[PDB]
Scaffold this active site. Structure first.
Site, PDB file in Angstrom:
ATOM      1  N   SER A  92       0.858  -1.190   0.000  1.00 51.62           N
ATOM      2  CA  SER A  92       0.000   0.000   0.000  1.00 51.62           C
ATOM      3  C   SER A  92       0.891   1.236   0.000  1.00 51.62           C
ATOM      4  O   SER A  92       1.692   1.394  -0.938  1.00 51.62           O
ATOM      5  CB  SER A  92      -0.991  -0.106   1.162  1.00 51.62           C
ATOM      6  OG  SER A  92      -2.025   0.856   1.036  1.00 51.62           O
ATOM      7  N   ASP A 214      -9.811  -4.863  -5.277  1.00 50.97           N
ATOM      8  CA  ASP A 214      -9.244  -4.032  -4.222  1.00 50.97           C
ATOM      9  C   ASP A 214     -10.058  -2.751  -4.157  1.00 50.97           C
ATOM     10  O   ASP A 214     -10.098  -1.987  -5.126  1.00 50.97           O
ATOM     11  CB  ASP A 214      -7.764  -3.728  -4.473  1.00 50.97           C
ATOM     12  CG  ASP A 214      -7.050  -3.224  -3.228  1.00 50.97           C
ATOM     13  OD1 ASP A 214      -7.712  -2.619  -2.358  1.00 50.97           O
ATOM     14  OD2 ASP A 214      -5.824  -3.438  -3.118  1.00 50.97           O
ATOM     15  N   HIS A 243      -7.341  -5.438   0.434  1.00 48.85           N
ATOM     16  CA  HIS A 243      -6.225  -4.497   0.428  1.00 48.85           C
ATOM     17  C   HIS A 243      -4.973  -5.081   1.070  1.00 48.85           C
ATOM     18  O   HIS A 243      -3.860  -4.653   0.746  1.00 48.85           O
ATOM     19  CB  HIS A 243      -6.627  -3.217   1.163  1.00 48.85           C
ATOM     20  CG  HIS A 243      -5.707  -2.061   0.929  1.00 48.85           C
ATOM     21  ND1 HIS A 243      -5.569  -1.451  -0.299  1.00 48.85           N
ATOM     22  CD2 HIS A 243      -4.887  -1.394   1.774  1.00 48.85           C
ATOM     23  CE1 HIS A 243      -4.699  -0.463  -0.202  1.00 48.85           C
ATOM     24  NE2 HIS A 243      -4.270  -0.406   1.046  1.00 48.85           N
TER      25      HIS A 243
END
Length: 263
Positions: A92, A214, A243
């Site tokens: 991320s 996602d 995620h």
């Protein structure tokens, strides 16, 4: 440093790989992955300043108004560990942080692997990021209205899957452990970030891993990175939802991550 960021160096393998974590969790997000890397790699894990497992007594909200503050942390840690060359894996926001840090010291990174990363979450002209500003406004006010009520709803959507699933419990727990005046502020920096200008300046090879489903990162963002990063790139779609798939679905993520680490 090191203690401030909970830096751990484990493994017996030949190659150095750094693992960075995204917003809401910490280095524990790699819990299921670490046992599969120590035989083949020497793993360094660390926590971003402002996470639950860190001491954010005098958090400099100016230092972390841009992802440069997180990037300088990474460089300082690798500097302190005397790391001259390593593979970086960023989940991320830690994906963009490694790309941003590689702009400053590209010799240190031989390979960057981003997982669920994104250079911008807001939509724009000819760019689908996934969110509008009024989508962000409701989330920011909901986080200030009742932070615990927000975490109970956000963690099921970030991880996907059931509210009772083990990844959800863990992520919501770490997400809820962030000091609230920091979580809202850091979620503003992240959710409103726009690092698209930086992407062409990246020369390190990047392997873009991305879940097919996602909610924070649409599939189209993977192809955008492939075309926007100035260095060699490849895109592999993971047959998962969520995620944080290395937490929820390590059975699928691990073979793909090691394949990109070894290839």
């Amino acid at each position: 440093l090191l203690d401030a960021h909970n830096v751990r160096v484990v493994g017996m393998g030949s190659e150095l790989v750094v693992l960075g974590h995204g917003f809401g969790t910490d280095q524990s997000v790699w819990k299921h992955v670490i046992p599969h890397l120590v035989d083949d790699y020497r793993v360094i894990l660390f926590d971003n300043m402002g996470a639950g497992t860190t001491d954010p007594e005098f958090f400099s909200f100016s230092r972390y108004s841009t992802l440069h503050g997180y990037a300088d942390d990474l460089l300082s840690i690798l500097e302190e560990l005397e790391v001259e060359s390593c593979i970086y894996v960023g989940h991320s926001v830690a994906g963009m942080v490694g790309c941003l840090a590689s702009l400053e010291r590209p010799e240190i990174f031989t390979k960057i692997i981003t997982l669920s990363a994104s250079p911008r979450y807001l939509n724009d002209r000819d760019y689908f990021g996934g969110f509008e500003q009024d989508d962000l406004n409701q989330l920011f006010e909901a986080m200030q209205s009742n932070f615990k009520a927000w975490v109970s709803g956000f963690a099921p959507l970030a991880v996907g899957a059931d509210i009772d699933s083990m990844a959800v419990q863990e992520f919501g727990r770490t997400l809820f452990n962030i000091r609230p005046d920091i979580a809202f502020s850091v979620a503003k920096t992240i959710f409103q970030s726009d690092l698209r200008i930086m992407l062409p300046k990246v020369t390190v090879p990047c392997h873009i891993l991305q879940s097919s489903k996602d909610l924070a990162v649409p599939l189209v963002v993977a192809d955008y990175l492939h075309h926007a990063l100035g260095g060699p790139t490849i895109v592999e779609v993971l047959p998962t939802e969520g995620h944080l798939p290395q937490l929820s679905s390590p059975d699928i993520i691990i073979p793909v991550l090691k394949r990109h680490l070894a290839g």
